[PDB]
């Protein structure tokens, strides 16, 4: 094996914002290295406008312009030329441009103010796209990645890429088909779930079911293709027709493709539009709406190096191969989920019964707690009601964070206290059993349907454990697997840490007085260890949500088994004496004919059921199709629209005010810190402003320096439902509100949702306030 | 009917009559949170265990009681009036349906004691709504 | 009745199908959610005797139910007034099946009776 | 014209003192627990051996939904 | 921002105007700004319409 490409599964997010390099993001290629970054622009800002269109202007523009100004209300010939040398026609529609010039009559300024209201006006404050860059990797006999392509004079790469959408052509999603499969049990999921038949899977019907016959069902697919190489870095979108081909026929984008003549290529995804093929079809279900179709693709890249002695290589076997995924926006990019699509893949190597092999080390469980420490930005329960978080603040304030890297005797009973707050993901703690035909009934704090039955609940008898989130299961009052708990693999980290039985490097003790300095510490053995291969294919996932599976947010339940991976292998540590979850070579299972696949538009009937994921399970059998991905198999089982699947992604309500439990926070935040608040406690008393913290500097300096710090405390503490951030329904008077206009609003204001972006506290003085904070931007405030 | 009407801009917030029909409360969880001092010999402070509480520094403590009093609850949600549940709609219609049985379980506010705000910056009254106990 | 090659060639294929009520767990509180009654007629009395359960059972009285005999010895079984309820007013009965919080007064069981001839 | 046949329903001969009165098949049925009641000495064979509520359980409630 | 076909206007070589109406197209602006009232809902347009009809005679002699 000679060249491969990286990371072998790329996401790129959709976003209303524009296709190019300085306005849109990148997929981290490295772990961790943007977490406390206070200068990140994740919305389109005015700044950005404005330089974009000084670097439009001459260009030999402004003389242009000025010869007109003493030739002469424009004619058309002159604003056909004035236009043409902007290039901005790849931004705004060329007509919307000469509108624009048509209402003027210094002449620069009328022009550069007149063009600035209508780039505003298409994308201020938009949510920028995250594309994805993939990579060319030279490799060793044993497909070791040693370093970048370098491309010389005469060298060549031709990038290929084939994307489809499936949604409207795939089933019903109701829960998570590998709920019910028999297994022996992985390091994502327990054995326990089916054997004691704890979430059952669920049928499911077709999408769009008045579409009848294979043949008529394929105008339900969305597929494009196109090619780049690096002769040329003109970007090609990526455009496909639904339905496909008196039919009524919208264009779809896809995404856009560009390559550098370094020859890396960058993708992006689509522009975020959903729509129904009738304005009266609303979208009124979190997963299933027919007659609905939207961008989200995913599908196979592949490449071939052309040398110039010659020698051609071609990129196209699995395990040399990639994929990319489309998925909806990050809004918190900087708060990571605490189980991640990284530890489906490695959990996924694991079997449950050699958990007790695996080897511990304290960089094993940190990621755990930073991360659920971290999820108090976006979910309240994290913030004021969750006492493994309020412990890290007691050890932090006193800087004894180091007793939790001590493995001794003397240390075990506060390890323990900790770990024993966690649920176990055997599912078989806090349970009563129905005929010791056995069921298992949670005898904790359940999660009712809303169908509700006017009799009295039965009282827990045991503590609700964390993390305060919902899981697959929770369709199934009193199933464990209502609430979610982190893999196998993970808990059994965390077991051996509270046991004593880990390791860890003084080094380590030496920077963990406090959670912040040992998650820094960590963030810079990501950035200085020497692998950028493997830790651009760990970047991509580690954003990423790994559970609970209801679908999901971008990717779901397939991705947790070893059968969708070609390939699956540790490595090595992250650094040689710190394994931090570790480094892996994975690849995906892929049909080498893509788009042409014959196994391009399979299914299972009328319904599919856990029976047809069991016959897939045979690599020879005629099921396992499901598992070899064509373009658009990884995202077909998600939400359609998208935009129904994030509405339907927030608080569950229970009974019992606190503590609130949230779906997938740290990706689509349920509870945020505005900037109306932080524009309210960023300032100290000694600021030189005519206004302090929303106070007249007479009024802010007059009030004693406690009383000054109080109030700062107060708007921190004050958190705003992000579904608030923008008009879901609830806006007016009589407005009706409820989790349906969500549904339905979502599709026009997942744009205009609120963005959390760490910012400075330059003085928090005694305040309390950290020093960097993570605050919700939204126009709503 | 008698709440929140909500602008296209976040805040504040208009209400119609909160002293008599409350729209944002300060729960009786979040006052046994934030109702007790330091030096409390009670085996959970403010629901820290007394280890917990007792290790951290003064500063820190007195913080997470204003963290806590800060945490006000939207008085609708003192009682399932119709947002409870996986799928529950919610919305004004439901509850208005469910205020009919529901008026009688909704949270109560009353004025209750702090005997040792300390500096924490909370008053020597506070005044705590309680619901279904 | 029904020809084989429904299931054989997948022609509607069957659903799964959740619990009725789901937010009353484990089976002994689920016995509250049936309703039951007995009785007894003899030939020496044509009194009715009305079949009457509770919903929750053991509030609401459920009339499942009207039993006589005449003194021929044959048996008139009358079903209930055809009463639906819900346990709480504002709990409608949305769905063609299965709407959670609901009774009714339909039932089905046993028959049995005992044949006393005066030889003894 | 038919035919007339002789016809009786399975009965569990305790009724409503059947230890079966209050079986089911946990948070869902399936074809599954149907296949498995085919065999009489399964677990699942009860469901075919009917205690009172069984004819009916099955329908819709209330009826006047069915009947809508 | 919508074009509205309110009409179509034909005359011919014997002086009669021939006036078309519209296609029957109705719209919002948004998709998800359903009609759910008889007669008054927001955000709705139609290309309904009614006007002035003027002419001018001009005859050979001037
Ligand atoms: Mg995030
Ligand atoms: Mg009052």
Redesign the interface.
């Known amino acids: 094996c000679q060249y491969k490409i990286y990371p072998p599964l790329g996401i790129a997010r959709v976003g209303n914002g524009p296709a190019i390099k300085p306005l849109s993001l990148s997929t981290p290629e490295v772990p961790w290295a943007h977490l406390y970054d206070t200068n990140v622009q994740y919305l389109v800002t005015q700044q950005e406008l404005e330089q974009l269109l000084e670097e439009a202007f001459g260009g030999n523009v402004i003389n242009e312009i000025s010869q007109i100004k003493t030739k002469l209300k424009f004619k058309q010939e002159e604003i056909e030329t004035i236009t043409g040398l902007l290039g901005l026609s790849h931004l705004v529609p060329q007509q919307q441009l000469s509108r624009s010039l048509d209402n003027l009559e210094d002449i620069v300024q009328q022009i550069k103010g007149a063009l600035l209201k209508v780039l505003s006006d298409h994308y201020l404050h938009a949510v920028k796209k995250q594309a994805q860059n993939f990579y060319i990797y030279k490799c060793d006999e044993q497909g070791n990645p040693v370093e970048k392509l370098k491309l010389t004079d005469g060298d060549k790469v031709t990038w290929r890429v084939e994307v489809a959408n499936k949604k409207s052509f795939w089933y019903d999603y109701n829960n998570a088909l590998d709920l019910s499969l028999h297994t022996q049990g992985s390091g994502n999921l327990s054995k326990n779930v089916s054997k004691h038949?704890?979430?059952?899977?669920?049928?499911a019907?077709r999408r769009n079911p008045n579409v009848i016959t294979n043949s008529l069902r394929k105008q339900l697919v969305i597929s494009s293709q196109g090619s780049v190489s690096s002769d040329n870095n003109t970007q090609v979108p990526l455009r496909g027709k639904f339905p496909a081909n008196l039919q009524e026929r919208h264009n779809v984008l896809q995404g856009s493709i560009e390559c550098d003549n370094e020859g890396v290529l960058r993708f992006y995804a689509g522009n975020g539009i959903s729509?129904?093929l009738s304005?009266?079809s609303?979208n009124t279900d979190?997963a299933d709406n027919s007659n609905w179709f939207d961008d989200i693709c995913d599908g196979r890249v592949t490449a071939v190096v052309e040398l110039k002695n010659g020698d051609t290589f071609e990129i196209q076997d699995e395990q040399s191969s990639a994929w990319v995924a489309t998925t909806p926006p990050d809004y918190a990019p900087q708060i990571e989920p605490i189980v991640t699509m990284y530890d489906m893949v490695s959990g996924a190597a694991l079997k449950e019964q050699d958990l007790d092999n695996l080897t511990t080390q304290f960089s094993d469980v940190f990621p755990i707690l930073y991360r659920l420490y971290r999820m108090q930005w976006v979910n309240?329960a994290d913030?004021?009601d969750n006492?493994v978080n309020?412990?890290i603040?007691?050890?932090n304030?006193?800087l004894?964070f180091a007793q939790l890297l001590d493995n001794s005797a003397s240390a075990k009973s506060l390890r323990e206290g900790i770990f024993n707050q966690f649920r176990n993901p055997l599912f078989d703690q806090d349970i009563?059993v129905?005929?010791p035909?056995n069921?298992w009934?949670?005898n904790s704090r359940?999660?009712?349907?809303?169908?509700?039955?006017?009799?009295a609940?039965?009282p827990a008898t045991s503590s609700l454990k964390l993390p305060f989130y919902?899981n697959d299961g929770?369709?199934?009052?009193?199933?464990p697997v209502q609430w979610f708990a982190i893999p196998p693999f993970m808990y059994q980290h965390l077991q051996n840490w509270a046991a004593g039985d880990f390791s860890v490097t003084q080094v380590e003790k030496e920077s963990a007085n406090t959670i912040e300095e040992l998650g820094l510490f960590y963030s810079e053995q990501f950035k200085n260890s020497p692998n950028s291969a493997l830790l651009c294919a760990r970047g991509a996932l580690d954003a990423l949500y790994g559970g609970g599976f209801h679908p999901g947010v971008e990717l779901t339940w397939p991705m947790r088994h070893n059968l969708i991976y070609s390939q699956n292998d540790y490595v090595s540590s992250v650094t040689p004496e710190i394994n931090l979850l570790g480094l892996r070579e994975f690849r995906l299972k892929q049909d080498l004919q893509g788009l042409n696949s014959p196994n391009m538009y399979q299914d299972f009937?009328?319904?599919i059921?856990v029976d047809n994921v069991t016959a897939s399970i045979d690599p020879n059998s005629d099921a396992a199709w499901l598992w070899r991905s064509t373009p658009g198999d990884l995202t077909k089982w998600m939400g359609i629209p998208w935009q129904s699947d994030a509405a339907?992604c927030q608080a569950?309500?229970?009974?019992e005010?606190?503590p609130i439990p949230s779906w997938w926070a740290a990706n689509l935040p349920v509870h945020v810190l505005?900037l109306?608040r932080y524009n309210k406690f960023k300032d100290s008393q000694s600021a030189d402003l005519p206004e302090i913290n929303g106070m007249t500097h007479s009024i802010a300096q007059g009030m004693s320096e406690?009383?000054f710090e109080?109030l700062r405390?107060?708007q921190?503490?004050?958190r705003?439902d992000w579904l608030?951030?923008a008009?879901l329904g609830?806006?007016?008077?009589?407005?009706?509100?409820?989790?349906?206009?969500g549904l339905?609003?979502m599709?026009?204001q997942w744009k205009n949702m609120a963005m959390v972006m760490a910012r400075p506290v330059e003085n928090p003085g005694?305040?309390?306030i950290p020093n960097v904070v993570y605050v919700a931007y939204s126009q709503?405030?």
């Open positions: 038949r704890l979430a059952p899977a669920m049928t019907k729509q129904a304005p009266s609303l979190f309240q913030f004021t006492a309020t412990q603040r007691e050890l304030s006193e004894g009563d129905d005929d035909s069921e009934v949670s359940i999660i009712p349907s809303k169908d509700e039955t006017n009799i609940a039965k919902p929770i369709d199934y009052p009193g199933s009937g009328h319904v059921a339907s569950v309500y229970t009974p005010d606190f505005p109306a406690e009383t109080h405390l107060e921190f503490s004050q705003l608030h951030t008009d609830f806006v007016g008077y009589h407005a009706e509100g409820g989790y349906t206009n339905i609003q599709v026009s005694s305040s309390g709503a405030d």
